[PDB]
Design an enzyme around this catalytic site. Sequence first.
Site, PDB file in Angstrom:
ATOM      1  N   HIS A 146     -31.976  19.282 107.778  1.00 36.99           N
ATOM      2  CA  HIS A 146     -30.500  19.318 107.577  1.00 36.99           C
ATOM      3  C   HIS A 146     -29.735  18.475 108.617  1.00 36.99           C
ATOM      4  CE1 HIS A 146     -30.738  23.147 110.062  1.00 36.99           C
ATOM      5  NE2 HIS A 146     -29.641  22.613 110.604  1.00 36.99           N
ATOM      6  N   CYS A 172     -29.875  25.227 116.292  1.00 35.37           N
ATOM      7  CA  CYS A 172     -30.814  24.533 115.356  1.00 35.37           C
ATOM      8  C   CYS A 172     -31.548  23.432 116.107  1.00 35.37           C
ATOM      9  CB  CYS A 172     -30.174  24.059 114.054  1.00 35.37           C
ATOM     10  SG  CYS A 172     -29.767  25.485 113.004  1.00 35.37           S
TER      11      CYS A 172
END
Length: 182
Positions: A41, A148
């Site tokens: 992502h 992340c």
Amino acid sequence: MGPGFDFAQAIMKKNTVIARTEKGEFTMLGVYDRVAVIPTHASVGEIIYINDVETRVLDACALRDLTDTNLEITIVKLDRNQKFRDIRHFLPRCEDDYNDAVLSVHTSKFPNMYIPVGQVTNYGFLNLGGTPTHRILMYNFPTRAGQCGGVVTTTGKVIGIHVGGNGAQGFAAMLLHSYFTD
Ligand SMILES: Cc1ccc(CNC(=O)C2CCC2)cn1
């Protein structure tokens, strides 16, 4: 504070860089030579910023399993003038559960951050942001935006990279030794 954290800090000081894409700043784990990993992502392009240096991407591959299911790991080869310490011998060979893991993050927003996340479950299938995803590890910590790409370690092993959470649990994509054979 203990051998868990010592292992974490060692991997973080020699094998991480700050990666910036158009989708934000991520912890990025260097694995060997000029090869690193990041969550898919992050949407890596032709150019990426590494520790605020403009860097050409020589290759980027979004991994999928042999069912053609997303694994949420992108392997990146960087046009960087310096190799990473080879840490492939700390990667697990098989899918597994773990005790007593640490999640480690290094960004502008969260420098030198270490979280003892505890027990890690081989969760398997997760609907991650609407995308069917396999080989997910789960830990019971309320992880947040900014984590992340964070590295998940135990004493002796680098087992995953943080890819999301639901407010109560956090989720990591497995790193396996077989991803980085050459
Ligand atoms: C900050 C720091 C650096 C190195 C070390 C020694 N241990 C290691 O190198 C681990 C094997 C993989 C990481 C401890 N702390």
